[PDB]
Structure formats: structure tokens, C-alpha cells
Amino acid sequence: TRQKQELEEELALAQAYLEPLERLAALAHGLDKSPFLRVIPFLLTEKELPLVEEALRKALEDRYLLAHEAYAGGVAALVVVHRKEVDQAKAALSRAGVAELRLPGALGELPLSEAARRLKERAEAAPRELSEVRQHLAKLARESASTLQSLWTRAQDEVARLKALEELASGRFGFALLGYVPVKAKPKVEEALARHKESV
Amino acid sequence: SKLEAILSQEVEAEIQALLQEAEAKAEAVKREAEEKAKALLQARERALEAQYRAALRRAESA
Amino acid sequence: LIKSLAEKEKQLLERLEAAKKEAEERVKRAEAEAKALLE
């Protein structure tokens, strides 16, 4: 139940940003970890690219490669200028409305090429993994639910006996109790009373 | 592009500074080696001359 | 996006490698000069 839920959530998070991160890593083929420029990619809305270009012109104009390539459901406006100037430019772009793609797990926590490779591997493996996990869970249910139900019935019986033992009244190494049974059921109750170890 | 170009210009300036520092270190090392060899050769020659003079003095006394 | 950034980073890396090679050559020259002076 942990593994199948984790595989389903991993498939969902991988399919949430599969193609757009691939297009961003395709567009980021010159400065992925180059030591002169950061990479703020924003899978953003429609053509407010001039409003982000206002913040890009607030950054350097002969620098800050900032454009949306493809997969325009979230238009992948990637921006690459500097370290500190790109930090100020990302702050100004978020003031104009922008967000660097900080996903959870490792896809928004690793380098985008390795993140895309791991996300592609997870999206390729998670379907067959979820199917085999569902098959294993169904087989385990069909093979163990009978013993689980028998153990649950025995445990319910033992716990009911334990709860009934609390409601007794002792007599200082003696015990006495009262109850109510039908006079039409007095024959089977008397047969069970004779079936006791003493017929008390 | 402009920021990568400015960083490349700064990298070229740093490479020139590193080459200048290596050249200055080599020059100072050669100067110190020459001074040490000169002092050692002068000390050894003066010690040989002084030992020769003292031995000649003791031999002339004998 | 690709060409200018990758080419500028590769050019700066090649300049740094050439500077390291020149510094190592100057260091080897100074070491050989000190060895010849000592000999």
C-alpha cells in the first residue's frame, strides 16, 4: 500500500511536468550548470511574454536569454542571464508574475537533464509497476482474506470475552453474577449449565 | 550572452593575472636560489681558505 | 540558449587550461633552474 500509492503519485508528478521540462532542457543546452548564468524556467501562462520582457529589459538586454519555446499549455519561458543579476531579474519577473519551476522530489531538486531522464524512467516504469502492484495486492487479498477474517472473528470473540470479564463481581476468591435469559430458552441454558464443569 | 561575455572577459583577466603571478614567483625563486648559492659558495671558499691559513700557521710553528 | 552559452563557457575553460599549462611550464622552468644552480 505504500509502494503502489508512491508509484501512482510518482506517475502523477512525472506526467504533470513531463513535456515542458523536456522542452526546457532542450532549450537550455548551453548553460545548464555553466558558471556564468542561472536558469529560471517558468512554465507560465499565455502571451504576457512582453510583461516578462519588461523585467528582462530591466535585466541585461544583450544577455538574459528569456523566451517560451513550445508546449504552450504552460509556455516554457526560460530565462538565463547571470547569478546575482539573474536573481534580481527573477525577483522582478515574479513581481511581474513568474515562477522558477521548483517541483518536489528530485525533478525540481536536481539538474534538469538528469531530472528529465529520471522523470522519463519513472513515467516509463510506473505503469507496469502499478499494474503489477495491483495484481499482487489482488492476489494477496484473494489468498489471505479468509485467514484474516477467521483471525478477526477469533479476536473479536476473545476481545468480547475480555470485555465481559470486566463486568463481573468477585467474592474474594469466589465469583457471583446475575443475568437474564428467556424461560423458553431455559432448556438450552440449563443444558449449557449442566455442560459446565460443576453444574454450578 | 552579455553576462557570459563579461564573465569570459573577467576569466581572461584572471588568466593574465595568474600568468603574471607565476612569472613573478619564478623570478623571485630564481633570485633567492642565486643568493643562497652565492652565500654558500662564499662561506665554503672562506672556510677552506681559513682552514688552509690555520694549518699553515700550525705547520710553521711546528 | 545553446550555442553562445556553450561556446563561451568552453572558450573560458580552454583559456583556463592553457593558463594552467603555462603556469606549470614556468614552475618547471624555475625548478630546473634551481636544480642547475644547486648542481
From Swiss-Prot, chain B:
Similarity comment: Belongs to the V-ATPase E subunit family.
Job of this protein: Produces ATP from ADP in the presence of a proton gradient across the membrane.
Protein's UniProt name: V-type ATP synthase subunit E
Record organism: Thermus thermophilus (strain ATCC 27634 / DSM 579 / HB8)
Residues of the full protein shown: 2 to 63 of 188
